[PDB]
């Protein structure tokens with residue numbers, strides 16, 4: 003019969019040899035299944051590599067081997083080899099290479115996007131190699147795969163490699179030929195690709211390893227794509243904010259796009275496209291409860307019992323207000339406003355309007371590498387102040403209500419009633435054409451309290467059917 | 473002993489000799505007041521002039537004398553002169569010219585924005601001259617003023633002439649030299665100005681005659697600027713839609729900027745600026761109820777007991793939905809989207825977003841000269857369809873809630889409760905940073921019934937003092 007499913011594992015699932023032992027244990031929980039494993043770098047080593055890169059640019063040549071992130075990375079992997087009882091030879095070569103590259107960066111005081119992609123590639127290259135070797139140690143015939151060396155073909159822009167159509171038949175042929183010759187559990191690298199023109203190593207951008215998994219899924223026409231987490235799938239809210247988060251058994255690919263990336267930390271909208279096209283359900287599973295259903299994401303689901311699906315919190319968002327009387331009935335003000343943002347390399351999140359104003363939220367900082375500094379903020383405001391009365395408000399927060407659009411008025415009446423009870427007034431509201439997501443801009447300090455109250459009202463007040471029938 | 477105030481009158485107020493008689497009666501109602509009168513063109517002549525322009529472009533030379541709109545404008549003014557019993561000479565010369573200008577357009581088959589401004593200038597030029605002559609007929613010493621001849625100094629962009637700072641000193645000086653020499657009631661053309669470097673006749677764009685009134689106000693430092701209508705000021709909604717519309721006694725310049733243009737048909741936001749910076753209250757009065765207060769627009773007002781201010785309806789709007797998985801975390805998607813619109817000469821109104829979509833609504837057609845034709849839409853969609861999945865939805869409507877931002881949640885709980893009762897789901901919601909204006913996108917067919925319901929709940933349910941206190 004052959005290959006059955008793809009299993010994707012994030013950084014923290016393989017943060018140590020001990021965690022790696024859990025993953026291996028999962029594979030052996032389903033021997034009636036023949037999976038493809040997709041691994042990220044060992045928890046936090048991807049971030050560590052990038053930090054090492056930036057540090058290298060300006061530390062000096064004679065002390066690139068001293069960069070802390072380098073010895074953090076070196077030691078994690080040496081130690082993981084020891085603990086799992088692997089031949090350290092292969093990993094030691096890759097680590098010496100890593101140090102060499104950083105000596106290169108330090109010498110040149112230069113770090114291009116092309117180099118950045120190469121740097122991070124060590125991460126999952128080390129990951130998959132350690133894990134594959136370990137499986138062979140414990141009797142599991144396994145083969146490690148560098149995505150960029152099988153059929154993963156992308157464009158040649160680096161931080162954001164776009165998967166090209168020729169990937170699907172190339173990957174399918176490569177993984178199939180190897181499996182039929184002699185079957186071994188494929189252990190494939192995360193957010194990596196080859197790139198058409200340069201041949202250089204590429205990262206898949208946002209929704210990295212998830213995209214790798216979904217791509218494999220479509221290429222091999224598998225029955226489902228599985229994404230593993232430490233909680234029971236997608237939850238009604240973030241358990242960090244409020245302990246009473248409950249699992250959400252069924253999602254729609256559409257609902258997921260509005261939810262899974264900021265609600266869970268998985269399945270960026272771009273990653274689910276190969277699964278939407280191939281019509282392959284995506285499942286989010288708990289590695290601490292692997293026999294449980296989790297969350298299936300499909301094209302459609304039974305909405306009969308559906309009122310609210312989940313609550314989402316964005317924290318510490320910067321809001322801008324852009325007011326001008328000239329706006330009303332003028333062509334090209336919106337074009338000018340967002341052009342300024344594009345010129346200054348800033349991505350904007352939420353947008354709302356009035357007759358004489360446009361209001362903004364900038365992407366949450368956690369979506370990027372750094373918070374914007376006062377310089378960069380004073381720069382947008384000055385540029386904007388040429389055409390409008392501008393006003394900047396730091397320390398705000400977004401609450402997103404993801405629910406069944408057929409009961410929007412029901413949702414909103416209840417929601418604002420709750421906020422009214424607490425004396426909370428939403429500063430900014432934005433919902434698009436019958437979209438499942440509606441955003442409230444609130445103060446950072448009152449956000450958690452609001453989320454908890456909203457959760458109590460929607461998910462802890464029993465079955466919500468006051469719903470008008472006959 | 474000095475000019476005391478400026479009174480502005482719209483087209484319908486001077487649509488005929490009979491309506492003009494009402495205006496003169498208003499002037500004589502306040503002999504203890506010395507007004508400056510700002511007149512629009514005789515109801516619908518402005519539109520008729522523009523219509524005559526378009527027709528001239530392609531009817532042929534011999535036929536220009538027979539343009540329907542030209543025949544209408546000729547007889548209205550000839551007949552008005554007849555009834556007011558004035559010397560027809562001045563008017564007859566101006567009508568000769570008008571026919572000559574159209575004969576020119578007809579020959580050349582070209583209508584520039586420069587000509588367009590000259591064409592419409594005849595409206596107020598006729599209007600003011602008839603009224604001025606009539607006042608002198610009945611014992612009211614009066615002097616007609618062409619705005620472009622008294623120091624309304626403007627930029628040389630035609631459809632949208634911008635008032636330049638040199639206007640205030642020039643106008644105050646010209647209007648005072650004439651009044652001190654011998655006092656007469658000034659009758660000024662409303663929609664007009666003179667280009668700085670062309671010396672050519674200019675129209676003030678949106679804001680129109682209202683702007684002329686407020687400009688004169690600031691220039692002469694008067695106590696108030698009065699805008700005349702046929703109803704008791706600004707109402708709680710449009711009486712055309714629901715009979716129970718009630719006067720809104722007090723308004724804020726900010727509230728007015730979100731309300732007056734679409735709620736009433738007066739005071740475009742750009743027209744209130746000279747009154748804002750000059751710190752002069754604007755009053756909206758009823759010509760059928762002249763001793764009544766109406767609506768005073770001031771910097772600030774007593775917000776105690778203020779909950780909802782007014783409900784606004786925008787009929788027949790076109791909504792667009794623009795969805796892409798790529799925009800989440802991308803710089804410049806908003807910049808491109810609205811660039812397309814700018815390149816296609818279209819002004820967008822309401823905007824909202826989701827994690828992977830941006831939705832928007834196009835300026836209501838009444839704000840323009842024509843509705844967008846099916847071809848023009850298909851081009852917007854095609855252009856947008858290159859970067860996203862696009863959906864066009866005709867036959868929607870906007871309900872705008874203008875209220876007290878301090879009771880946002882209260883207002884919203886109630887509103888959505890009403891909508892839920894009716895079984896209505898809002899398709900798109902948009903409120904900017906603590907703005908008084910929140911917009912719902914609804915279906916055109918259900919809109920009117922919704923407005924009535926909302927009005928019943930907010931303005932007819934008695935005193936709405938159930939606020940959280942101790």
Ligand SMILES: C[S@@+](CC[C@H](N)C(=O)[O-])C[C@H]1O[C@@H](n2cnc3c(N)ncnc32)[C@H](O)[C@@H]1O
Nearest residue numbers: 346347348349364365367370371372373374378
């Ligand atoms: C603002 S531009 C940098 C300035 C300039 N364009 C350049 O490249 O030299 C991007 C930087 O700001 C950070 N950043 C923080 N918030 C951002 C946002 N909302 N959109 C874009 N970049 C953001 C990113 O991590 C990145 O380091």
Ligand SMILES: C[S@@+](CC[C@H](N)C(=O)[O-])C[C@H]1O[C@@H](n2cnc3c(N)ncnc32)[C@H](O)[C@@H]1O
Nearest residue numbers: 816817818819820834835837840841842843844
């Ligand atoms: C949209 S452009 C016409 C498109 C044409 N291809 C061009 O570039 O000149 C302006 C015309 O469309 C009409 N129009 C209707 N709705 C409009 C809107 N929302 N924004 C701009 N123009 C609009 C105006 O009356 C005006 O006559």
Ligand SMILES: N[C@@H](CCCC[NH3+])C(=O)O
Nearest residue numbers: 013042043048192210211
């Ligand atoms: N795969 C790397 C970078 C993030 C990719 C997101 N799937 C890691 O988690 O260490």
Ligand SMILES: N[C@@H](CCCC[NH3+])C(=O)O
Nearest residue numbers: 349350799802804805806
């Ligand atoms: N490209 C857009 C991204 C946001 C799209 C709407 N959620 C920007 O520059 O901010």
Ligand SMILES: N[C@@H](CCCC[NH3+])C(=O)O
Nearest residue numbers: 483512513518663680681
């Ligand atoms: N004079 C025209 C237009 C004035 C400007 C209106 N915005 C009228 O009769 O209303």
Ligand SMILES: N[C@@H](CCCC[NH3+])C(=O)O
Nearest residue numbers: 332333334335336819820
């Ligand atoms: N300049 C904007 C006008 C609308 C601004 C938002 N209310 C446009 O091009 O559509």
